Amino acid sequence: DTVPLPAPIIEAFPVEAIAEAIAGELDKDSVNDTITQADLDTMTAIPLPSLGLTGEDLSVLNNEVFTNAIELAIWSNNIGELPDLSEALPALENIEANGANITVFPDANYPNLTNVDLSQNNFGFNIPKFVGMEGLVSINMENAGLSGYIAEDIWMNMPNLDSLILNENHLISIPEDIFLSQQLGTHSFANQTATYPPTTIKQGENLKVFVPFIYQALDFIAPLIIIKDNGRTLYEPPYPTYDGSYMYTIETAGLQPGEHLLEISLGYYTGWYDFPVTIT
Ligand SMILES: [Ca+2]
Ligand SMILES: [Ca+2]
Ligand SMILES: [Ca+2]
Ligand SMILES: [Ca+2]
Ligand SMILES: [Ca+2]
Ligand SMILES: [Ca+2]
Ligand SMILES: [Ca+2]
């Protein structure tokens, strides 16, 4: 639960960097100085950028309640799994966490959360759903390592969402519902790139890959596509048509044995996908 106050800052938050930061905001000259609940109530923001903090370090904030802090500044840290800070930040409205090496942004109860900047983090396959943050107006996840497949129906639980930035990620699918609903006055999905796991096939067979983006793109346009092998163009086929599956076949039957890096380059929404292949 919490640490009873009054108490010294170092007892309330036993992480050097965090206690020095709190001491600085309250203008106390030492982490040994005593703070009251009234002192924590004067903080409208939590300035913790660029301090080498991990998720564990930050979890210490839950030892108290900053009843009026409306902003959390944690950019340029080394977080990993971000803890659930709703206990400590009940009035939170804005999260500025650019390039903080966050790998997981958990579902957390932040009623007043309006804006979140999670750009340049590194989620990998941990796509966040923002459960508990139904009031969000703008989300920025530009160049944040978002990877894999995402459902057509995610992010349909935020009635005021007006800006969703997702360019420069590694998604192989499109969140169709939200882009087609027309709520968003600002949106970006450009440059999605991904290198699929490597696989093996026999000399003569031709590779079938799972790429939903190729087909979903059609719900946003109406036609180019290029197929390359180890960086050189192999053929430029006509854009396919959707009829029930997201599998795309690439003509590798004529290729000789050895290592081959196949690439599907799309352009007009845009991107490229690599498929490392070993032909026997
Ligand atoms: Ca120090
Ligand atoms: Ca100061
Ligand atoms: Ca003092
Ligand atoms: Ca930008
Ligand atoms: Ca709108
Ligand atoms: Ca569809
Ligand atoms: Ca077909």
Short mmCIF file of C-alpha atoms and ligand atoms in Angstrom, two decimals:
data_model
loop_
_atom_site.label_atom_id
_atom_site.label_comp_id
_atom_site.label_asym_id
_atom_site.label_seq_id
_atom_site.Cartn_x
_atom_site.Cartn_y
_atom_site.Cartn_z
CA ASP A 1 0.00 0.00 0.00
CA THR A 2 1.59 3.44 0.99
CA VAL A 3 4.38 4.77 3.28
CA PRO A 4 2.94 6.83 6.17
CA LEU A 5 3.63 10.60 6.13
CA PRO A 6 5.20 12.76 7.35
CA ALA A 7 8.43 11.00 6.45
CA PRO A 8 11.81 11.66 4.79
CA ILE A 9 11.83 11.64 0.99
CA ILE A 10 14.37 8.74 0.92
CA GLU A 11 12.02 6.61 3.08
CA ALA A 12 9.02 7.39 0.89
CA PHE A 13 10.86 6.80 -2.39
CA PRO A 14 14.03 4.69 -1.86
CA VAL A 15 15.62 5.12 -5.31
CA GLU A 16 18.40 7.78 -5.37
CA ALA A 17 17.44 9.36 -8.72
CA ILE A 18 13.72 9.57 -7.92
CA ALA A 19 14.22 11.01 -4.42
CA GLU A 20 16.62 13.67 -5.81
CA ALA A 21 14.08 14.54 -8.48
CA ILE A 22 11.26 14.91 -5.89
CA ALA A 23 13.61 16.91 -3.67
CA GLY A 24 14.29 19.22 -6.62
CA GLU A 25 10.62 19.85 -7.43
CA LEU A 26 9.77 20.68 -3.81
CA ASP A 27 12.98 22.64 -3.59
CA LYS A 28 14.36 20.66 -0.60
CA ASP A 29 18.14 20.51 -0.37
CA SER A 30 18.32 16.83 0.80
CA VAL A 31 16.58 13.47 0.31
CA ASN A 32 16.55 13.24 4.13
CA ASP A 33 14.20 16.22 4.44
CA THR A 34 10.69 15.45 5.60
CA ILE A 35 7.70 15.87 3.30
CA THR A 36 4.00 16.04 4.06
CA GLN A 37 0.97 15.00 2.07
CA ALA A 38 0.49 18.80 1.57
CA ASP A 39 3.94 18.96 -0.12
CA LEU A 40 3.07 16.11 -2.53
CA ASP A 41 -0.21 17.94 -3.34
CA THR A 42 1.75 20.95 -4.75
CA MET A 43 3.21 18.79 -7.54
CA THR A 44 1.33 19.28 -10.80
CA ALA A 45 3.91 17.25 -12.73
CA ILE A 46 6.37 14.37 -12.19
CA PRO A 47 9.63 15.35 -13.93
CA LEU A 48 11.69 12.17 -14.23
CA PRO A 49 13.19 12.35 -17.72
CA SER A 50 16.58 10.96 -18.65
CA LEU A 51 17.56 9.38 -15.29
CA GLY A 52 18.31 5.77 -16.28
CA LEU A 53 15.17 4.56 -14.49
CA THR A 54 13.74 1.05 -14.95
CA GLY A 55 10.12 -0.07 -14.36
CA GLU A 56 11.13 -1.34 -10.87
CA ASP A 57 12.57 2.06 -9.98
CA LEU A 58 9.35 3.80 -11.04
CA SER A 59 7.10 1.40 -9.09
CA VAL A 60 8.33 3.21 -5.97
CA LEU A 61 6.00 6.14 -6.92
CA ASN A 62 3.08 3.95 -5.75
CA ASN A 63 4.35 4.42 -2.16
CA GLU A 64 2.37 7.67 -2.15
CA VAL A 65 -0.43 9.55 -3.88
CA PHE A 66 0.35 12.73 -5.88
CA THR A 67 -3.32 13.83 -5.81
CA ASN A 68 -2.79 16.73 -8.31
CA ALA A 69 -0.06 15.57 -10.65
CA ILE A 70 -1.55 15.84 -14.15
CA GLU A 71 1.65 15.05 -16.09
CA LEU A 72 4.18 12.21 -15.99
CA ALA A 73 7.50 12.97 -17.77
CA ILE A 74 9.59 9.77 -18.15
CA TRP A 75 11.26 10.17 -21.56
CA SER A 76 14.85 8.96 -22.25
CA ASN A 77 14.74 6.33 -19.43
CA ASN A 78 15.41 2.56 -19.64
CA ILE A 79 12.08 1.18 -18.48
CA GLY A 80 11.20 -2.23 -19.93
CA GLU A 81 7.85 -3.19 -18.29
CA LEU A 82 6.19 0.03 -17.09
CA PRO A 83 4.32 -0.46 -13.82
CA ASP A 84 0.67 0.43 -13.17
CA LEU A 85 0.96 3.91 -11.56
CA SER A 86 -2.81 4.67 -11.28
CA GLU A 87 -2.57 4.33 -7.47
CA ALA A 88 0.01 7.17 -7.36
CA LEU A 89 -1.33 9.28 -10.21
CA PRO A 90 -5.13 9.44 -9.93
CA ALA A 91 -5.30 12.87 -11.68
CA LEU A 92 -2.98 11.93 -14.57
CA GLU A 93 -3.92 13.60 -17.89
CA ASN A 94 -0.71 13.43 -19.90
CA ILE A 95 2.14 10.91 -20.33
CA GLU A 96 5.31 12.03 -22.16
CA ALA A 97 7.44 8.88 -22.53
CA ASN A 98 9.36 9.19 -25.80
CA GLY A 99 12.47 6.97 -26.18
CA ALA A 100 12.15 5.48 -22.72
CA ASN A 101 12.76 1.88 -23.88
CA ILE A 102 9.29 0.77 -22.71
CA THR A 103 8.46 -2.80 -23.78
CA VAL A 104 5.00 -3.05 -22.12
CA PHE A 105 2.46 -0.33 -21.42
CA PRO A 106 -0.12 -2.09 -19.19
CA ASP A 107 -3.86 -1.63 -18.96
CA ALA A 108 -4.32 0.82 -16.11
CA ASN A 109 -7.09 2.86 -14.61
CA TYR A 110 -6.47 6.51 -15.63
CA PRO A 111 -9.91 8.17 -16.02
CA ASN A 112 -8.51 11.62 -16.85
CA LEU A 113 -5.80 10.46 -19.27
CA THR A 114 -6.11 12.59 -22.42
CA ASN A 115 -2.74 12.30 -24.14
CA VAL A 116 0.02 9.70 -24.33
CA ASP A 117 3.40 9.99 -26.23
CA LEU A 118 4.90 6.47 -26.46
CA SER A 119 6.85 7.09 -29.63
CA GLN A 120 10.31 5.51 -30.03
CA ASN A 121 9.82 2.83 -27.43
CA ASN A 122 10.16 -0.90 -28.14
CA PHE A 123 6.96 -2.88 -27.72
CA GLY A 124 7.77 -5.75 -30.08
CA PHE A 125 4.63 -7.92 -30.04
CA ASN A 126 3.19 -6.25 -26.90
CA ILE A 127 0.55 -4.09 -28.58
CA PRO A 128 -1.30 -2.09 -25.88
CA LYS A 129 -5.14 -1.92 -25.83
CA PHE A 130 -5.39 1.01 -23.35
CA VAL A 131 -8.04 -0.62 -21.10
CA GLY A 132 -8.79 1.84 -18.28
CA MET A 133 -7.89 4.86 -20.51
CA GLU A 134 -11.22 5.21 -22.33
CA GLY A 135 -10.90 9.03 -22.27
CA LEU A 136 -7.82 9.23 -24.53
CA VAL A 137 -7.88 11.92 -27.23
CA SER A 138 -4.44 11.42 -28.81
CA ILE A 139 -2.01 8.51 -28.97
CA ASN A 140 1.45 8.68 -30.47
CA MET A 141 3.31 5.39 -31.10
CA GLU A 142 5.48 6.49 -33.98
CA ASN A 143 8.54 4.33 -34.51
CA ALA A 144 7.85 2.32 -31.31
CA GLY A 145 8.65 -1.23 -32.54
CA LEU A 146 4.97 -2.34 -32.74
CA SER A 147 5.07 -5.69 -34.42
CA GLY A 148 3.02 -8.50 -35.86
CA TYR A 149 -0.67 -8.74 -36.49
CA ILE A 150 -3.33 -6.48 -34.92
CA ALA A 151 -7.08 -6.97 -35.03
CA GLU A 152 -9.39 -4.92 -37.24
CA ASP A 153 -11.44 -4.00 -34.12
CA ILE A 154 -8.81 -2.74 -31.61
CA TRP A 155 -8.96 0.79 -30.26
CA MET A 156 -12.76 1.05 -30.72
CA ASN A 157 -13.27 1.55 -27.00
CA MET A 158 -12.18 5.29 -26.96
CA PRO A 159 -15.04 7.57 -28.08
CA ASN A 160 -12.98 10.81 -28.04
CA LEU A 161 -9.82 9.53 -29.73
CA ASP A 162 -9.01 12.09 -32.43
CA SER A 163 -5.32 11.49 -33.23
CA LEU A 164 -3.55 8.14 -33.71
CA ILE A 165 0.07 8.20 -34.97
CA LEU A 166 1.46 4.76 -35.94
CA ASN A 167 4.00 5.31 -38.75
CA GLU A 168 7.42 3.57 -38.82
CA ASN A 169 6.34 0.42 -36.97
CA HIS A 170 6.56 -3.28 -38.00
CA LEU A 171 2.90 -4.21 -38.35
CA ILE A 172 1.70 -6.70 -41.02
CA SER A 173 -1.91 -5.73 -40.61
CA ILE A 174 -4.08 -2.63 -40.43
CA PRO A 175 -6.45 -1.56 -37.60
CA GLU A 176 -9.26 -1.06 -40.14
CA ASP A 177 -12.23 -0.17 -37.95
CA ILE A 178 -10.65 2.89 -36.33
CA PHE A 179 -9.34 4.33 -39.64
CA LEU A 180 -12.69 3.74 -41.40
CA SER A 181 -14.87 5.10 -38.56
CA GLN A 182 -13.85 8.69 -39.46
CA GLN A 183 -13.38 9.84 -35.78
CA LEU A 184 -9.72 10.60 -36.36
CA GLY A 185 -8.87 14.11 -37.56
CA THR A 186 -5.16 13.13 -37.58
CA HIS A 187 -3.73 9.72 -38.50
CA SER A 188 -0.62 8.09 -39.88
CA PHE A 189 0.24 4.52 -40.79
CA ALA A 190 3.13 4.99 -43.24
CA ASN A 191 6.26 2.83 -43.49
CA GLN A 192 5.46 -0.56 -41.92
CA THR A 193 8.45 -2.91 -42.30
CA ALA A 194 9.08 -6.43 -41.09
CA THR A 195 11.49 -9.29 -41.45
CA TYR A 196 9.63 -12.60 -41.03
CA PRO A 197 11.12 -15.62 -39.29
CA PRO A 198 13.41 -17.63 -41.62
CA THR A 199 12.09 -20.81 -43.29
CA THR A 200 13.21 -23.63 -45.62
CA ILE A 201 11.72 -24.94 -48.91
CA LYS A 202 12.85 -27.41 -51.60
CA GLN A 203 14.32 -26.30 -54.99
CA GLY A 204 11.20 -26.07 -57.21
CA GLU A 205 8.44 -25.21 -54.68
CA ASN A 206 7.14 -21.66 -54.35
CA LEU A 207 6.68 -19.81 -51.05
CA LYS A 208 3.31 -18.79 -49.53
CA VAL A 209 3.53 -15.96 -46.97
CA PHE A 210 0.91 -14.43 -44.55
CA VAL A 211 0.63 -10.68 -45.26
CA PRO A 212 -2.79 -9.19 -44.40
CA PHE A 213 -1.58 -5.64 -45.13
CA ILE A 214 -1.41 -6.35 -48.89
CA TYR A 215 -5.12 -7.09 -49.06
CA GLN A 216 -6.40 -4.65 -46.40
CA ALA A 217 -4.68 -1.76 -48.23
CA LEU A 218 -7.43 -2.11 -50.88
CA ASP A 219 -10.01 -0.80 -48.37
CA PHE A 220 -8.10 2.53 -48.59
CA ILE A 221 -7.09 2.70 -52.35
CA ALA A 222 -7.76 1.24 -55.88
CA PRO A 223 -4.80 0.46 -58.26
CA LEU A 224 2.34 -0.82 -57.24
CA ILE A 225 4.04 -4.02 -55.95
CA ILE A 226 7.63 -5.32 -56.48
CA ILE A 227 9.21 -8.72 -55.62
CA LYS A 228 12.97 -8.80 -55.01
CA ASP A 229 15.54 -11.47 -54.33
CA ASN A 230 18.67 -10.50 -52.38
CA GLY A 231 18.01 -6.84 -53.21
CA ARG A 232 17.51 -7.21 -57.01
CA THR A 233 14.08 -7.05 -58.68
CA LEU A 234 12.72 -10.47 -59.72
CA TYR A 235 9.30 -9.44 -61.15
CA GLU A 236 6.57 -6.75 -60.82
CA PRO A 237 3.22 -8.58 -60.73
CA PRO A 238 -0.22 -6.95 -60.82
CA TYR A 239 -1.62 -6.12 -57.41
CA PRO A 240 -3.65 -9.10 -56.05
CA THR A 241 -7.34 -9.24 -55.14
CA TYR A 242 -8.93 -10.40 -51.88
CA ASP A 243 -11.22 -13.49 -51.98
CA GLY A 244 -10.97 -15.16 -48.50
CA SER A 245 -7.32 -15.48 -47.30
CA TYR A 246 -4.30 -13.32 -46.52
CA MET A 247 -1.79 -15.72 -48.08
CA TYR A 248 0.34 -14.36 -50.92
CA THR A 249 2.32 -16.71 -53.17
CA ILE A 250 5.71 -15.58 -54.49
CA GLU A 251 7.28 -17.22 -57.56
CA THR A 252 10.40 -18.86 -56.07
CA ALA A 253 10.16 -22.03 -58.22
CA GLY A 254 12.81 -20.77 -60.67
CA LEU A 255 15.34 -19.87 -57.97
CA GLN A 256 18.44 -22.01 -57.42
CA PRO A 257 19.56 -23.55 -54.10
CA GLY A 258 21.25 -21.51 -51.38
CA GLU A 259 20.33 -18.50 -49.28
CA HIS A 260 17.72 -16.02 -50.55
CA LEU A 261 16.19 -12.93 -48.94
CA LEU A 262 12.82 -12.26 -50.55
CA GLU A 263 11.16 -8.89 -50.34
CA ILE A 264 7.69 -7.59 -51.14
CA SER A 265 7.94 -3.81 -51.65
CA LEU A 266 4.63 -1.88 -51.65
CA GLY A 267 4.19 1.81 -52.59
CA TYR A 268 1.56 4.41 -53.60
CA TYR A 269 -0.27 3.49 -46.68
CA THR A 270 3.13 1.94 -47.68
CA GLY A 271 5.92 -0.52 -46.61
CA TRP A 272 8.14 -3.60 -47.25
CA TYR A 273 8.39 -7.17 -45.91
CA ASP A 274 11.43 -9.52 -45.90
CA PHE A 275 11.32 -13.31 -45.94
CA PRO A 276 14.66 -15.08 -45.34
CA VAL A 277 14.60 -18.37 -47.25
CA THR A 278 16.91 -21.35 -47.68
CA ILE A 279 16.26 -23.38 -50.82
CA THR A 280 17.52 -27.02 -50.87
CA CA B 1 22.84 11.75 -7.30
CA CA B 2 14.91 23.24 -7.09
CA CA B 3 17.02 20.52 4.48
CA CA B 4 7.06 12.58 -36.88
CA CA B 5 -13.19 13.69 -34.35
CA CA B 6 -11.48 -6.35 -43.84
CA CA B 7 -6.86 -16.64 -54.09
#
